[PDB]
């Protein structure tokens, strides 16, 4: 899986230890193993949401499988629980595009997982 | 919604409102209330179209409804004349990606839209 | 097509003939004139693959048609070979994701290829 954060939010607020923090709770969340984790998160854009450039995040969770309705919805509450916490954003300024990826559309390793 | 530019021309060349205006041309064009609408600028990036790094961009816009062949054609040329009249790209050096986003991959405020 | 690094290299260790390598060996892959390539590098960003921060990209390659199984699986050869020799990175430490784009959600000069 992939999960991307893009926030307003200066990289300063960006504590360490949030990279492996998402790591292990989407490993967990998911029910992947971390080795199979990736995790990007891109501080100081440029970004409104709603008109206000109040803090703000829009996100994506690519996976191979474990979407669903039940699934995202649980994701939500603890990647919004998440950003909340760690970066002070406001969950109702978070968006999370969630992505059910076909094994023969996502390459790894000179092949797919097809 | 959600619209992404990234583009290689330089950030101060992006005008003061621009985000402002998306929000609000988004907001007239996809008829969703602008609080919806979030918007995300990407300027000074490392780009090439055609294999020519002169001005360009790379946008894709997301949102549950609202996507489909007339209205595409509509945002296309929207947002083509918005970044030829603010930051001068040429409208044959823009690709947009269109996405419609079923509600219950999207989430938002600890929840789903579904 | 439109193809997108995001990657943990320093912006110095990406060549700078990188994105037009890109542009044609894209070109010769898809079978499409470079003219309708996009290519985009986002270096320095802050990532992790498997819990780690070595050297690593997270990709996306969209294209109207000239997507599936066994051209995916060939994709990500050159890709990753790619990777590997410019930018010095582990091609198990690279995710590709393969988008087939309908011409009625690509806009591009002032309107979409549908
Ligand atoms: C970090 C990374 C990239 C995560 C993917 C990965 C890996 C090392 C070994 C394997 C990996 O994912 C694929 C896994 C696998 C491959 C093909 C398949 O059909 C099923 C699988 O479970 C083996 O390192
Ligand atoms: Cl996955
Ligand atoms: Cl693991
Ligand atoms: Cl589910
Ligand atoms: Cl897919
Ligand atoms: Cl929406
Ligand atoms: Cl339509
Ligand atoms: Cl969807
Ligand atoms: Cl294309
Ligand atoms: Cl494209
Ligand atoms: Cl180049
Ligand atoms: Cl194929
Ligand atoms: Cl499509
Ligand atoms: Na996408």
Same mark, same amino acid.
């Given at each position: 899986?992939?999960?991307?954060?893009?926030?307003?939010?200066?990289?300063?607020?960006? !504590?360490?230890?949030?990279?492996?923090?998402?790591?292990?709770?989407?490993?967990?969340?998911?029910?992947? !193993?971390?080795? &199979? #984790?990736?995790? @990007?998160?891109?501080?100081?854009?440029?970004?409104?949401?709603?008109?206000?450039?109040? !803090?703000?995040?829009?996100? /994506?969770? @690519? /996976?191979?499988?474990?979407?669903?309705?039940?699934?995202?919805?649980?994701? /939500?509450?603890?990647?919004?629980?998440?950003?909340?916490?760690?970066?002070?954003? /406001?969950?109702?300024?978070?968006? #999370?595009?969630? &992505?059910?990826?076909?094994?023969?559309?996502?390459?790894?390793?000179?092949?797919?997982?097809?």
């Amino acid at each position: 899986p992939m999960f991307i954060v893009n926030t307003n939010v200066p990289r300063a607020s960006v !504590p360490d230890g949030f990279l492996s923090e998402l790591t292990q709770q989407l490993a967990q969340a998911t029910g992947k !193993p971390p080795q &199979y #984790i990736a995790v @990007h998160v891109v501080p100081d854009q440029l970004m409104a949401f709603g008109g206000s450039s109040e !803090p703000c995040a829009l996100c /994506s969770l @690519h /996976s191979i499988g474990k979407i669903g309705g039940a699934q995202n919805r649980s994701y /939500s509450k603890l990647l919004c629980g998440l950003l909340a916490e760690r970066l002070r954003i /406001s969950p109702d300024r978070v968006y #999370i595009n969630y &992505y059910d990826m076909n094994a023969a559309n996502v390459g790894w390793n000179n092949s797919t997982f097809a």
